[PDB]
């Protein structure tokens, strides 16, 4: 389901976005993370895979706090089980 995948991604992004503070304070910085998702949308684990130490810390906090909903289905879950996240504020 292509739209389900996109809409769920947008909900992950939306969820993290709202726990992500002073975004433009990091304009120019980059951080990339990897998550491990539970089937109910809880974060099992998150590891920073490079970038600006300060942005990365904020990103880590955002994600840990984010309230990611349950995937629309197991199919969509599988797609994002190990999703990489990019934080590149503008």
């Amino acid at each position: 389901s292509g739209a389900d995948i996109n809409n769920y991604a947008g909900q992950i992004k939306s969820a993290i976005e709202s726990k992500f503070y002073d975004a433009s304070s990091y304009a120019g910085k980059t951080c990339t993370l990897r998550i491990k998702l539970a089937p109910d949308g809880m974060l099992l684990d998150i590891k920073p895979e490079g970038g600006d130490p300060a942005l990365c810390q904020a990103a880590l906090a955002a994600a840990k706090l984010a309230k990611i909903p349950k995937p629309p289905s197991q199919a969509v879950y599988e797609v994002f089980k190990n999703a990489p996240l990019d934080f590149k504020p503008a």
Partner: protein, 61 residues
């Protein structure tokens, strides 16, 4: 289809595929143009598909 034409196209939120990485940044082909990812982006399909904010930066190639 020129750089100037691409820049004039609207940014959007959504998924592009066959995304590639130059330096710290990610790019993808769309509408004969190249778009760049900003914001918080979510990856999948082995990091070749990315959801987020895409902005046209230049023409293909």
């Amino acid at each position: 289809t020129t750089d100037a034409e691409c820049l004039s196209k609207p940014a959007f939120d959504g998924t592009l595929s066959n995304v590639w990485k130059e330096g710290d940044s990610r790019y993808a082909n769309f509408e004969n143009c190249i778009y760049e990812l900003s914001g918080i982006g979510i990856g999948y399909d082995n990091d070749t598909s990315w959801n987020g904010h895409w902005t046209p930066v230049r023409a293909a190639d």
